[PDB]
Amino acid sequence: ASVKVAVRVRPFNSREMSRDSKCIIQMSGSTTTIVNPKQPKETPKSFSFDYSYWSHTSPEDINYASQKQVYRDIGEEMLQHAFEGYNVCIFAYGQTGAGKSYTMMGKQEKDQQGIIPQLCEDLFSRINDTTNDNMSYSVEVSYMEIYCERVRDLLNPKNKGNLRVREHPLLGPYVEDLSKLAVTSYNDIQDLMDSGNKARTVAATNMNETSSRSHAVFNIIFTQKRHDAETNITTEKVSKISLVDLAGSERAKGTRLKEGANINKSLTTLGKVISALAEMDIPYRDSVLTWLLRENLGGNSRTAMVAALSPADINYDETLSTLRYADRAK
Ligand SMILES: Nc1ncnc2c1ncn2[C@@H]1O[C@H](COP(=O)(O)OP(=O)(O)O)[C@@H](O)[C@H]1O
Ligand SMILES: [Mg+2]
């Protein structure tokens, strides 16, 4: 499938605990139902997806969708599509606090690593364990934040200023002066991640709360160089992997007119793009995010989205909204 959609519900968080929230979400197979706390005597609205991940409890539970499970269904198949020579995208969509960052980057400890570190680890593992003198590889990475139409390099502490996305008259859009680093090992790319994740939550980021108002894009340029001993020449196969942690879907009160405008525009545009992609079996320039990722959202590409869901009753409206958004992706 060129477009896969999964939803994932998390355990209660602190706000919900202090609120004595009821769980209004239940799952069965590929189906997720949601109860309207103000109307308990109804039958819940139902939704069906490629995957409905029940992670509302914990790894101690036999039925708990772990980071490992999610990655092996969605992430693993994407990496394989990249080895086959084509571009891929994985988006985490949802309300602030619903579980987007946890699903994508997760935690630094044992057992809690998200899609990004698991995919990177898997990649280098397949590379180093590739036995063949004719096959060599190169892995380059970029990590940035898209906030109010401007780009922030997370791999360069003194990213002096806000870099613009530009459209090369022939080779496509790109971020000017954005750092792209060649990495030769996992611990090395892992170093970059930690370093970038660190930059997303420093104290200064609380001024404009960019951790929840900007889109975080982790890009990997995967190049496979194929040698051939007969008539001695290499053929390069380049795959682009974009792993995205979108801005909170609820900010699309207290939200500034322009932050909200851009975020709405971004999420709305991404939705049209994906629905179109799923249609095929497209206004890219309408937002910086969809503009920068156009090549990873083409007819050749493959995309998957994981929509994070809060379990509690207090977030019924935003959670329904997220489910509808995922349902439209198709
Ligand atoms: N499946 C999960 N298992 C354990 N903790 C989770 C899960 N999903 C989310 N969380 C916790 O919930 C909070 C919300 O997620 P992040 O913080 O992922 O928010 P957002 O969706 O805004 O990026 C974090 O404290 C995270 O540790
Ligand atoms: Mg987050």
Instruction: Kindly list the catalytic residues.
Output: 97, 99-102, 245, 248
In one-letter notation, the amino acid at residue 97 is: G
Ligand 1, pocket residues at CB < 6 Å? 10-11, 13, 55, 94, 96-102, 212, 248, 308
275 annotated as ligand-binding: no
Q: Which atom of ligand 1 is nearest to the CA of 94?
A: 21
Q: Is the dihedral of CA 115, 120, 121, 127 positive or negative?
A: positive
C-alpha closest to that of 64 among 52, 75, 53, 48: 53
What burial class does residue 253 get, using C-beta atoms within 10 Å of its C-beta: 0-12 exposed, 13-18 middle, 19+ buried? exposed
What burial class does residue 202 get, using C-beta atoms within 10 Å of its C-beta: 0-12 exposed, 13-18 middle, 19+ buried? exposed
Which of left, alpha, beta for 177 (phi over 0: left; psi -120 to 50: alpha)?
left
C-alpha closest to that of 98 among 16, 213, 9, 200: 9
E runs forming strands in 268-317: 302-309
| Rounded-to-integer distance, Cα 200 and Cα 212, Å | 9
Count of C-beta atoms within a 10 Å radius of residue 2: 18
* Experiment used for this model: X-ray
Distance from the alpha carbon of residue 152 to the mean position of ligand 2, in angstroms: 16
Protein residue with its CA nearest to atom 7 in ligand 1 = 10
Going by the DSSP 8-state scheme, the letter that residue 22 receives in this structure is P
Distance from the alpha carbon of residue 309 to the mean position of ligand 1, in angstroms: 10
Query: Whose atoms come closest to the Cα of 200: which ligand?
Result: 2
| Rounded-to-integer distance, Cα 173 and Cα 161, Å | 19
Distance from the alpha carbon of residue 201 to the mean position of ligand 2, in angstroms: 10
What burial class does residue 317 get, using C-beta atoms within 10 Å of its C-beta: 0-12 exposed, 13-18 middle, 19+ buried? exposed
Q: Which atom of ligand 1 is nearest to the CA of 245?
A: 23
C-alpha closest to that of 56 among 16, 10, 90: 10
- Residue 29 near residue 284 (C-beta atoms within 8 A): no
- List phi, psi (to 5°) of 311: -85, -25
64 annotated as ligand-binding: yes
Going by the DSSP 8-state scheme, the letter that residue 73 receives in this structure is I
In one-letter notation, the amino acid at residue 310 is: S
The resolution, in angstroms to one decimal, equals 2.2
- Residue 271 near residue 251 (C-beta atoms within 8 A): no
316 annotated as ligand-binding: no
- H-state helical runs in 160-236: 186-200, 210-213
| Rounded-to-integer distance, Cα 178 and Cα 298, Å | 23
Helix (H) or strand (E) holding 4: strand 3-9
| Rounded-to-integer distance, Cα 78 and Cα 4, Å | 10
46 annotated as ligand-binding: no
The span from the first CA to the last CA of the chain, in angstroms, equals 11
Count of C-beta atoms within a 10 Å radius of residue 236: 9
- Ordered structural domains, the chain, with CATH: 1-330 (3.40.850.10)
> How far from the centroid of its chain's Cα atoms is residue 326's Cα?
14
Structure tokens at 204: 């200064």
Q: Identify the residue whose tokens are 């060129």.
A: 2
